[PDB]
Amino acid sequence: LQALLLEQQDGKTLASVQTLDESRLPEGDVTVDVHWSSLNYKDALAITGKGKIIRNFPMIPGIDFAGTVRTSEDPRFHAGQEVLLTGWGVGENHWGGLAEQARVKGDWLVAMPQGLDARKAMIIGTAGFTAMLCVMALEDAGVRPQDGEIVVTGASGGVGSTAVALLHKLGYQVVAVSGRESTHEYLKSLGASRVLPRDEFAESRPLEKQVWAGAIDTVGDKVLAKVLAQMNYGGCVAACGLAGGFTLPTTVMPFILRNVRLQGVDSVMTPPERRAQAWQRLVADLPESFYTQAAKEISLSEAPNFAEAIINNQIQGRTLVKVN
Amino acid sequence: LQALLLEQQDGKTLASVQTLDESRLPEGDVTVDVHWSSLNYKDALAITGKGKIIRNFPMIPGIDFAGTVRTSEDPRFHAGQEVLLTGWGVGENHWGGLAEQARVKGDWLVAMPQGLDARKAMIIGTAGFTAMLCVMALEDAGVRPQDGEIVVTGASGGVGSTAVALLHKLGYQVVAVSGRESTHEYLKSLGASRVLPRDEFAESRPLEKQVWAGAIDTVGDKVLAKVLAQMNYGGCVAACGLAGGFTLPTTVMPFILRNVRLQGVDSVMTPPERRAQAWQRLVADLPESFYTQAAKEISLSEAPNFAEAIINNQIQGRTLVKVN
Numbered sequence: 001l002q003a004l005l006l007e008q009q010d011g012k013t014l015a016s017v018q019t020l021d022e023s024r025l026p027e028g029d030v031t032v033d034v035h036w037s038s039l040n041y042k043d044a045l046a047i048t049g050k051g052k053i054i055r056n057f058p059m060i061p062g063i064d065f066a067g068t069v070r071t072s073e074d075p076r077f078h079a080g081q082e083v084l085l086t087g088w089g090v091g092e093n094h095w096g097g098l099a100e101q102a103r104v105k106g107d108w109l110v111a112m113p114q115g116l117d118a119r120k121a122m123i124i125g126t127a128g129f130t131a132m133l134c135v136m137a138l139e140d141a142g143v144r145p146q147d148g149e150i151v152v153t154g155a156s157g158g159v160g161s162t163a164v165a166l167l168h169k170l171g172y173q174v175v176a177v178s179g180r181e182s183t184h185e186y187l188k189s190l191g192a193s194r195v196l197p198r199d200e201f202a203e204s205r206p207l208e209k210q211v212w213a214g215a216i217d218t219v220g221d222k223v224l225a226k227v228l229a230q231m232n233y234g235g236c237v238a239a240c241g242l243a244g245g246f247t248l249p250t251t252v253m254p255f256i257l258r259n260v261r262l263q264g265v266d267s268v269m270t271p272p273e274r275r276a277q278a279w280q281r282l283v284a285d286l287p288e289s290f291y292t293q294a295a296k297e298i299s300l301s302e303a304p305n306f307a308e309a310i311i312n313n314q315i316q317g318r319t320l321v322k323v324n
Numbered sequence: 325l326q327a328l329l330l331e332q333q334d335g336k337t338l339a340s341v342q343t344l345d346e347s348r349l350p351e352g353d354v355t356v357d358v359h360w361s362s363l364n365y366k367d368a369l370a371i372t373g374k375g376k377i378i379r380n381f382p383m384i385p386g387i388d389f390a391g392t393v394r395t396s397e398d399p400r401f402h403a404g405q406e407v408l409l410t411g412w413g414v415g416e417n418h419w420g421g422l423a424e425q426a427r428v429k430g431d432w433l434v435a436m437p438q439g440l441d442a443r444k445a446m447i448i449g450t451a452g453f454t455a456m457l458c459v460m461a462l463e464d465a466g467v468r469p470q471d472g473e474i475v476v477t478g479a480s481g482g483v484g485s486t487a488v489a490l491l492h493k494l495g496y497q498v499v500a501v502s503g504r505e506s507t508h509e510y511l512k513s514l515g516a517s518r519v520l521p522r523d524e525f526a527e528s529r530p531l532e533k534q535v536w537a538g539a540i541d542t543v544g545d546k547v548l549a550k551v552l553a554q555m556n557y558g559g560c561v562a563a564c565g566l567a568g569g570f571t572l573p574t575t576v577m578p579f580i581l582r583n584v585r586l587q588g589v590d591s592v593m594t595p596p597e598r599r600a601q602a603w604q605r606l607v608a609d610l611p612e613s614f615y616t617q618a619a620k621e622i623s624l625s626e627a628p629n630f631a632e633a634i635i636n637n638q639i640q641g642r643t644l645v646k647v648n
């Protein structure tokens with residue numbers, strides 16, 4: 001059993017791949033032979049030791065996995081069945097998916113959606129799952145294509161890439177915000193009508209000119225504050241991230257004078273029914289071209305190279321991890 | 325034609341009751357003989373000159389009125405008809421309701437709902453209208469009496485008083501936040517289960533203990549920031565005010581880790597359909613005891629005094645205004 005393992009000394013996190021035994025895995029009524037995982041921003045924070053994502057060491061990181069069920073004391077799952085997992089504290093406070101085996105509670109698993117397989121499921125991963133929940137939040141708020149432009153921040157990343165592709169597919173005019181010139185052609189190829197620079201979202205009045213029918217935000221901080229000030233009357237912002245900072249120095253003005261909805265989107269504890277709905281929607285609404293335009297396959301032990309890259313804003317798209 | 329008129333010299337606002345000619349009224353399709361108005365927080369800002377609510381003087385303030393139609397060039401409205409008005413820029417950049425006559429666009433009016441008269445309509449006013457929109461926002465977010473406690477800030481005020489009464493009638497367990505010990509009995513009599521002091525809502529961590537199923541906030545600033553940190557997973561905050569300050573020094577944490585919705589509530593430009601729904605619901609759900617328990621009926625020339633009291637956190641309930 002090969003596993004990426006986090007250890008802690010003198011404050012710092014060390015990441016290495018070690019050969020563990022089956023016996024070291026935590027209790028959990030379903031054992032899964034993991035074939036694929038991925039790197040999300042939260043995984044990168046954990047692996048580099050930034051932000052105190054993980055409080056208990058040693059720890060196998062990886063909030064995502066997909067593979068084949070080895071055994072099951074949960075009668076909903078059987079040996080041979082393709083399953084996936086995102087969230088539920090896995091990869092944070094419970095040994096995760098960046099390993100050839102994981103053991104988890106059956107409630108945390110999702111039976112493989114029809115039209116999907118383990119590889120494609122992990123290209124999507126937590127970031128794509130989260131993008132879908134964000135699109136669904138915009139739809140719950142009555143934001144339709146004809147209402148105006150949708151803005152996506154941190155657009156070149158995982159959630160952002162998925163969001164641009166989903167929205168373009170669903171008929172929306174999408175505007176991407178990126179802090180790098182090198183992402184422009186990639187973002188246009190995903191379906192973005194144009195790409196605005198991040199340095200134009202550094203400061204804002206409480207109320208800016210109305211330009212967005214809706215928004216999907218992955219950066220928080222001053223970018224989210226400006227986006228809120230730019231929302232159309234009745235518009236909605238689906239906020240899922242903190243890539244630019246966890247604080248939100250905003251005002252009540254967009255809320256109380258423009259009836260703006262700021263919908264928070266969490267992926268960790270998404271209830272079973274909405275979880276299943278999001279996956280079903282991804283199979284239908286994410287075009288097959290995405291799985292080759294946005295994905296980069298890496299091996300397990302080179303994950304820390306790419307975790308550093310994520311933190312350092314040197315990553316584009318989705319990092320798929322082949323575990324075997 | 326009696327009217328509270330605001331002038332401006334040396335950057336200070338001067339409020340007085342003057343007798344004006346009919347010919348000084350602005351152009352409008354519908355002339356209304358106003359019998360009743362009210363004072364909301366916004367009117368108080370305008371009358372005292374605090375903030376920049378009013379940019380063009382002279383101005384008749386008053387974002388609300390109710391009365392009888394005098395003349396009409398708009399075929400939807402006839403002489404003799406009972407009508408009300410809240411918002412639409414009236415009392416801000418168009419001569420308002422604290423006067424014996426107003427002249428307005430027919431789109432801005434609401435035909436008197438059945439079960440309601442001009443007096444009761446202004447006891448409710450913008451503040452009560454707003455409270456109803458906030459309760460409706462909580463319902464849109466799936467918050468039900470069984471889900472847990474609803475917190476109402478600035479509870480002794482107009483929006484707050486209406487909110488507590490509406491929620492108690494609808495079956496919710498309500499918790500009021502007030503910064504004065506003198507409001508406690510009043511708030512209990514409206515339907516509040518308990519009253520927490522406002523000094524316990526000053527500083528907050530990004531995430532506090534989950535305690536609120538939903539919230540209606542009239543204060544903004546640091547009170548709203550703490551309430552956000554205290555929301556249950558999937559909870560909703562309807563935010564409509566800035567009584568404690570217009571800034572919002574919060575974080576993204578409640579949003580991204582607890583799926584919290586921050587629904588902003590505006591009353592100025594609420595579209596016709598939603599507007600009519602709120603008034604219909606106010607007739608259904610506001611108990612008759614509210615009109616006696618929260619109302620204080622003043623004359624036009626007492627409006628500057630009551631405006632000061634509002635800014636200085638010295639009123640309780642709703643200020644109704646007998647215009648004639």
Ligand SMILES: NC(=O)C1=CN([C@@H]2O[C@H](COP(=O)(O)OP(=O)(O)OC[C@H]3O[C@@H](n4cnc5c(N)ncnc54)[C@H](OP(=O)(O)O)[C@@H]3O)[C@@H](O)[C@H]2O)C=CC1
Nearest residue numbers: 041130154156157158159178179241242243244266267268
């Ligand atoms: N709570 C939850 O359940 C979930 C939360 N998330 C959140 O979504 C957010 C993004 O996730 P993911 O796509 O995986 O991360 P990525 O790193 O792949 O993308 C984030 C993007 O943000 C931009 N960015 C990076 N650094 C900064 C910075 N310092 N200031 C401003 N912008 C920056 C970059 O785009 P560019 O170069 O174009 O500016 C980058 O591509 C994360 O904060 C993550 O926590 C995601 C899934 C679930």
Ligand SMILES: NC(=O)C1=CN([C@@H]2O[C@H](COP(=O)(O)OP(=O)(O)OC[C@H]3O[C@@H](n4cnc5c(N)ncnc54)[C@H](OP(=O)(O)O)[C@@H]3O)[C@@H](O)[C@H]2O)C=CC1
Nearest residue numbers: 256365454478480481482483502503565566568590591592
């Ligand atoms: N955008 C829109 O369409 C609408 C906005 N609103 C807003 O709702 C808010 C309240 O309206 P309204 O009820 O009419 O005003 P009120 O003055 O009647 O209510 C405000 C309450 O807030 C509390 N308060 C007052 N000052 C402070 C302070 N400095 N710090 C903390 N709390 C304070 C008081 O309660 P206590 O003493 O118990 O602490 C007071 O009763 C206003 O900001 C108003 O503009 C209302 C309707 C519509």
